């Protein structure tokens, strides 16, 4: 056979490549644009913001507009990867606990619209655990539009213990824009949002102790970092560096009543059979671009520890390439001998119909 194609659809970015590679061949923005050709996808859809009405097909992880998603996939196949989908089995990723109806539309589009010889849909968080080389653990997947905690035991996810936190990279990006603005600068436009997203990714970090970090930055300049704008203006970022990602642990800074990532992780563990909570505590795996902040692991360690029984062994695993662990796990799974029997063949589709997805996929 040829290569399966691994397509990781995200809320902000989409990752695509060939099973067997250790990194996705292409990564582009999850946006489609039409007149305010007929449509535009990715970076070129943004540079035409003023003349195009932009839409975001994947919000908070769920596909909300199928015509748009279909265009993202068409763009992924012909423009990005430059392959014929009918000559490749396709593995798509999806968010945990998504509408059963969605899973059927994904299958249908892949077969009836792209004529894929075979496809499959897999929960992102599970792929990340596989990427870490485990079959048991609790993954904290945090991206650009949504965050989930997914307990997995012996290779299978535990639906009833999965939680969803609507706080991720996009919220943090805007929050950084707001505090720097309060600082004396002015970041409010979509063009500027792209700039603050870059600042956030390069100079932000999670303090081990908020207050102490605040005190150190209020009486010293030791934590300050300079950032240069394209036009040459140099701006300094002080406590914003850590105050921004702090919103993950304290959503209230954003007017949100939901509990932080550490507490949400703990809550997923408690929803699990007491017999496996230990395995989960010693195997808390970070995933997604938003778990990339320097210092986040040691902070998760300290916070989880404070929540769990004193006799509990805590361990936070923060893979270096966790910004793509989902896609990678997909690359790994698609090539698994034991996984081949899971693909949904076009034959299995013609006979059983779209509903075949609930049998082999879930
Ligand atoms: C990557 C996924 C699948 C490959 C399954 C995977 C186990 C597996 C691996 C290789 C070959 C066969 C099965 N681990 C899971 O949680 C899956 C596996 O799905 C199947 C069909 O086993 C688990 C299913 C349940 C019932 O546990 C679910 O939680 C279900 C609601 C969501 C789907 C989970 C599946 C996940 O998307
Ligand atoms: N080094 C970094 N530090 C902090 N944040 C980062 C870093 N690198 C990337 N990010 C953020 O990670 C987010 C993108 O992560 P990812 O691609 O995993 O999410 P997604 O799949 O696009 O969306 P979601 O999974 O929520 O549906 C963006 O907010 C990006 O700015
Ligand atoms: Ca994702
Ligand atoms: Ca609070």
UniProtKB/Swiss-Prot annotation:
Residue positions, PTM Tele-methylhistidine: 60
EC number of the protein: 3.6.4.-
Mod. after translation: N-terminal cleavage of acetylated cysteine of immature actin by ACTMAP.
Catalyzed reactions per annotation: ATP + H2O = ADP + phosphate + H(+)
Gene Ontology biological process terms from the UniProt entry: chromatin remodeling; maintenance of protein location in cell; mitotic cytokinesis; ovarian fusome organization; sperm individualization; tube formation
Pfam family, one: Actin
The entry's keywords: Acetylation, ATP-binding, Cytoplasm, Cytoskeleton, Hydrolase, Methylation, Nucleotide-binding, Oxidation
Protein origin, superkingdom: Eukaryota
Class of the enzyme per the UniProt entry, highest EC level: hydrolase
TM spans (from-to): none
Job description of the protein: Actins are highly conserved proteins that are involved in various types of cell motility and are ubiquitously expressed in all eukaryotic cells.
Protein family (similarity comment): Belongs to the actin family.
Annotated PANTHER family: ACTIN
Subunit structure and binding partners: Interacts with Rab6.
Further information: In Drosophila there are 6 closely related actin genes.
Name of the protein this chain belongs to: Actin-5C
Taxonomic source organism: Drosophila melanogaster
